[PDB]
Structures are given as structure tokens and as C-alpha cells.
Amino acid sequence: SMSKQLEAESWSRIIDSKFLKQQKKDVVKRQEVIYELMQTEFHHVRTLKIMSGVYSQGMMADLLFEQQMVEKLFPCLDELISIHSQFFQRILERKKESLVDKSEKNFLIKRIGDVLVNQFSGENAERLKKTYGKFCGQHNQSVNYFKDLYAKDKRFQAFVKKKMSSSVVRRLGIPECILLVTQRITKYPVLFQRILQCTKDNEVEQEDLAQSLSLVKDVIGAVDSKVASYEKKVRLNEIYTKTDSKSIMRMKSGQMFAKEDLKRKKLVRDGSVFLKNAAGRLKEVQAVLLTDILVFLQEKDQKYIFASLDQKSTVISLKKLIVREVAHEEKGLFLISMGMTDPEMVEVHASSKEERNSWIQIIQDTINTLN
Amino acid sequence: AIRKKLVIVGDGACGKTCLLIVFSKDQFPEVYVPTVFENYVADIEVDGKQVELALWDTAGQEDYDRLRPLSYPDTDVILMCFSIDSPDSLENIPEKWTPEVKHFCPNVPIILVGNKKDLRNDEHTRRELAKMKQEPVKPEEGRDMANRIGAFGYMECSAKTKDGVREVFEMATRAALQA
Ligand SMILES: Nc1nc2c(ncn2[C@@H]2O[C@H](COP(=O)(O)OP(=O)(O)O)[C@@H](O)[C@H]2O)c(=O)[nH]1
């Protein structure tokens, strides 16, 4: 079995001593890196399978967790198992066809680049983006859910202690498994890059490897961005619930805006600022820029309310909104709703001139994107 | 118990992975050094206290700012690394790494680690750095930085020679046991 063979700490130890002696240093080095990819992929699959076969299965059977509770700890686990089982088997296939003579021990992989380009392009890439985007995007919630269950659910705690006691190693407790999975994807560029630089005179392999290196970075870049989307969604939900059903704001159109309108909006940026009314008093408020609308909220009685400012709409469509600096006031900024017969102007004051400028740029960017 | 989590951070190429590997591995990697580090739970004893010290690498996450901080929650000690052959990697310590680490890990102790100390007296290194009128980081510059960022302490090491490696993790463990 390969699982038994993969106990070998290095390529130089999995092959015969006689066969090792016949190879150049730079060959040994290159095979050592490929073996490491292969063996750490093996380890990763095993980790996923512990999450599924030990933890998930036990939670469902012993604690009567439904499928959907396990998804709060281990989202997309089945799909991850499918992706990496298949990737790993493709690596084994190439290994098997790289054996030397009738030996089933000694192998020498001349070419791995094509296997990598395939796994990290087309539909395989999209699957990786979608799956890691969701898993990493929910990573902190997943761990937080574990911690709350462990701290407060007596049965869950007892269950976890029993698993740690006998079934699985310390390295693979539940949050540790989650972090192992989240960290896997960013291991690939380092490994691929080292294989490339260890590949000295094979242009098609060098070219493939180069390609796979860039492609995996694109996958990671998209995953990282998707995590930013989840940070924004989770943050918007913090605000939405903090707002209480009580508060309402009329928009320039006449449309009444309320707490439930804040979902399912998409948040761009939020932060504390000050509104300046016509009397010139500064009112502490959360600027909440959404993709289509700008909202201002006062924190009163430990809950958010739609801010009041001289009977003006503080729920503002970005459609025909114009953004200007306040002349001779570096921390200030004007918002003019040109889509009315009496365009309402709203003056807002930041913590600094730097923060004032950044608020103007992102609002302008958000307006430009919208139209 | 006693279970502590350790995370290592620092610029790309400063020796984060090599340090974890040479510390963790049962036999020192004389011929092949692995490219990556998965995770590890080291059994280590300092001042008559048995600790299970989990080790985590951030290598690979330096460029991905939403992914990297997923490594931070529940950390009991941070190894914050620069390379002695890279004054540029030292200036990133207060400028990038310190505010990130203190924000994601408030009140978690930091060990400032100067890696690749075998290269301080390396002539090739001295010539390359000298092109930019730079030189290797001096031990005092390291200690002064540790003080300016509020580090629990300063340690120098070489993963190549293993010199100073055991002391880095023994210190880190002491830091982790504090309250
Ligand atoms: N001379 C010397 N080189 C080292 C030492 N530690 C690591 N390196 C090398 O520096 C490079 C980057 O090491 P790595 O651990 O990958 O850095 P990372 O990007 O922080 O993970 C590799 O070529 C290592 O072999 C060291 O202690 N001395």
C-alpha cells in the first residue's frame, strides 16, 4: 500500500539504497520536493478524513447533530475531500507511471507540471475558489462555534475529550484541523516554486510549473478576496441586529427605510464620523457605505438608530450623489443629492484629513461602480 | 494541559519555516530541508513545568492579508522574525508586523528573533548588503528594537547551525506560561 510506503520520511528513504546511489544531487533534490508535495497532500487528505470519519460522524451519531450543524464547524468538507482525493490520486497515477523497471518501490517523476496546471485551471480552479472561499470565509465563525460548544455544551465537551483521549493525535483537535485546512492552500505556491527552480533543463516542465505557480496564486487571491466579502457580510450583520426595529428614515423618493432594508445589502465600508448640522454641532455617527446607498447611524441606548439631521434623509442613494471637500476645512466633506429639485447637502467631518480623503475616494469609487 | 499555541511571523525569506523544522524534527535535516511545515506539538519543559507547545507557520500567507490573520486567534506566544542579513526585514518589524500582531493578539507576548545569524560575518552577505550602503543587523540594534516594540525578549539564532534555536523556544515557552 502507498499509505504504508508514505510513512517514509523522505524520497531518499522510500526508494532502495542501491537506486538512490545511482542518482545525481540535483535529481535527488528535485524528487525530494515532489515527494514532499505528494506526502503533504496525503497528510492533508488524512486530516480531512479525520474531520469527516471521526469528528463529523461522531457528532452526528453521539450528539445527534444534523448535517447542517456539522457544516457550521466543517463547511464544504465533502467537496474538499472530493477535490483533494482526486488531486492526490492524479499524483499517485503519475508516480505509478514513473516507477523504474519491475520495481514497485523505486520511482522518479520526470514530469509533474501538467498535473498541477490541470488541478489549478478551468473548472477545478473554480471549485477550489468556491470551496476555500467559503471555508476560509467562515473559518473564524467555525472556530468560535467550536469554542462556544466546548465551553457551554457539557455533552459536546465530554465527546471532544473522549476523541482527544483515544481516537486522534494532539495535532488534530477540531480548531487545529480547521487551521490545517485553511493553511493548506497557501502551501502550494512555495512547493511549486521550489520544484520549478529545482527543474534545470526541461523547458516544457519549467513552463508548466511556472504556469501552475501563477494559477495557484490566482486561486489564493480569489479566496483571500472572498474572505473580505465574508468579513463585510458578518460586519453588516453585527450592525443590522444592533439596529432595533423601532427606527425608520424617509428617503428623498419617499421610500421609508428600516432595519430590515439593511439586509440583504452589501457593505463597502463602515466607520465612526461626525455629521455637522446647520447649527454647527457635531453628531457622532457610524458612516455605513453600502454598494448602492449611504447610511448614517447614531448609537443610542446601546442600539443603532438612523441618524437625524435637520429633517434630511440620512439614508442616501448614491445614484446622482456628488462628493465635495469642504473648502478651508480639511476634516470635512459634503454630499449633494442632485436627484431632487432641492438637492439636500449633508456635511460630514472625519477624524483627520487623511481619513477625510479616503472616505471621498471610496464613496466616489462606489458611485462610479454603481452607474 | 498545559497546552500553548505558538505562531511565527515575519517577512518572506527570513527563515520562519527552517526554524520550526530544525526545532521540531527528531533528527536535524543534514541533507534535505523540507519546503513547508504543517503543524507540530512539541513537548518541552522549562522551570519544572511540562508544556505541549503547538507550532504554526505563516509562511505562504505573507501576501494574503485576509488569510494570514486566521492563524492568530488563541495564540499564547508570537515569534516575530527578521533576518540578520536583512536590515529591510528589521524595519518591517515595527512598521508592519507589530501593529498587526498587537491588534489580532492583544497582550500576547512577543519574542523578537533575529534569524540567519551565521551570516553576520559572511563576506558574500557583507558585499551584497554594502551595495546599498547597508550591513548586517547588529545585536544591539536587535535588542533596541525588542525594547521599542515591547517584546518579552530578544533572541538570535541560526537554523543552519542550530545555534540559539533551543533558547528561542525555551524563552517563548516561558512567555506563554505568564499571565
Ligand atoms: N544561511 C542561512 N540561511 C537560512 C537560515 N534559515 C533559513 N535559511 C534560508 O533562507 C531561505 C528562506 O528560508 P524559509 O524558512 O523558507 O523563510 P520563510 O520565507 O520565512 O519561510 C531558504 O533558502 C533557507 O534555506 C539560516 O539560519 N542561515
Author numbering:
A (entry chain B): 1970 to 2340
B (entry chain A): 3 to 181
Quote the passages of the study that discuss this structure, keeping the authors' original sentences.
Crystals of the RhoA–DH–PH domain complex were obtained in the presence of GDP which allowed the structure to be determined by X-ray diffraction to 2.1 Å (1 Å=0.1 nm) resolution. There was one molecule of a 1:1 RhoA(GDP)–DH–PH complex in the asymmetric unit. The AKAP-Lbc DH domain interacts with the switch I and switch II loops of RhoA, with a buried surface area at the interface of 1319 Å2. The RhoA switch I loop is bound between helices αA and αH of the DH domain. At the N-terminal end of switch I, there is an extensive hydrogen-bonding network with the DH domain where the DH domain Glu2005 binds simultaneously the backbone nitrogen of RhoA Val38 and the side chains of Thr37 and Tyr34, while the DH domain Arg2163 also forms a hydrogen bond with Thr37 as well as the backbone carbonyl of Val35. The Rho switch II loop is bound in a similar pattern to switch I, with polar interactions between each end of the loop and the DH domain, and a hydrophobic packing in the middle.
AKAP-Lbc (also known as AKAP13) is a member of the A-kinase-anchoring proteins.
